[PDB]
C-alpha cells in the first residue's frame, strides 16, 4: 500500500514498498514525505539493496527452492558496507 522514497548520494530516488524497506533496521529506526536520504550510499549500491528487500520479502517463509542472491565482485565491498550500515 504505502510507499517510501530512498534517495542515494547522487540524487537517485528509489520508491519501494514500506514493508519491504523495513527489512533495514536503520530505515525502521527512522520511519513509523516518508523518505530517507543516504549521503554515503551511491545509486548503484542502493539499487542493489532495494532488490534484496524484494528478494527477502518474497522468499522468507517460502517453501520453494531459494535462489542465490547475486553479488558482483565489483560491488562486494560497497554492498557489504551498505548492508552493515543498514542492518539488513
Amino acid at each position: 500500500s504505502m510507499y517510501v522514497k530512498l534517495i542515494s548520494s547522487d540524487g537517485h530516488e528509489f520508491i519501494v514498498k514500506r514493508e519491504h524497506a523495513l527489512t533495514s533496521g536503520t530505515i525502521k529506526a527512522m520511519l513509523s514525505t516518508n523518505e530517507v536520504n543516504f549521503r554515503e550510499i551511491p545509486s548503484h549500491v542502493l539499487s542493489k539493496v532495494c532488490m534484496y528487500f524484494t528478494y527477502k520479502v518474497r522468499y522468507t517463509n517460502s517453501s520453494t527452492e531459494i535462489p542465490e542472491f547475486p553479488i558482483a565482485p565489483e560491488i562486494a565491498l560497497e554492498l557489504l558496507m551498505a548492508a552493515n550500515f543498514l542492518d539488513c
Binding site: 510507499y3 520508491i15 519491504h20 548503484h44 524484494t54 522468499y59
Partner: protein, 104 residues
C-alpha cells in the same frame, strides 16, 4: 506467474510487482497512485520500444524467468510535458570503483 519490475524515468526508480496477465494500463494505475500522474500522462517503454495499454506484461516480453526479485526487469517511463510528451531519459546509476588488488 508474478513479475518484478523497475519503472525508471530520469532519476526515479520504482520497485513494484505485477503479473504476466496484468495489462500495461493496470501498471499505469500503479504509477498513478505513487506519482500522482494519471495514465494518459504516462508512456511505458521497454528499451526504446513503446508499450500499448492493451497488452499484458507477458505478451510484452516480461517473463517470470526474466523479471525475478533479485534482478527485476526495467520499464521505461516518460511524462507529458504540458503540451506533449518528453523524451524518454533514464539517468544511469553510478559506477563501481576499480576492483581492489587483493580481490579475485
Amino acid at each position: 506467474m508474478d513479475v518484478f519490475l523497475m519503472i525508471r524515468r530520469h532519476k526515479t526508480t520504482i520497485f513494484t510487482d505485477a503479473k504476466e496477465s496484468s495489462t500495461v494500463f493496470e501498471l499505469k494505475r500503479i504509477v498513478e497512485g505513487i506519482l500522482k500522474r494519471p495514465p494518459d500522462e504516462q508512456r511505458l517503454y521497454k528499451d526504446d520500444q513503446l508499450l500499448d495499454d492493451g497488452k499484458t506484461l507477458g505478451e510484452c516480453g516480461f517473463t517470470s524467468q526474466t523479471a525475478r526479485p533479485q534482478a527485476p526487469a526495467t520499464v521505461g517511463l516518460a511524462f507529458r510535458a504540458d503540451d506533449t510528451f518528453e523524451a524518454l531519459c533514464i539517468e544511469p546509476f553510478s559506477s563501481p570503483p576499480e576492483l581492489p588488488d587483493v580481490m579475485k
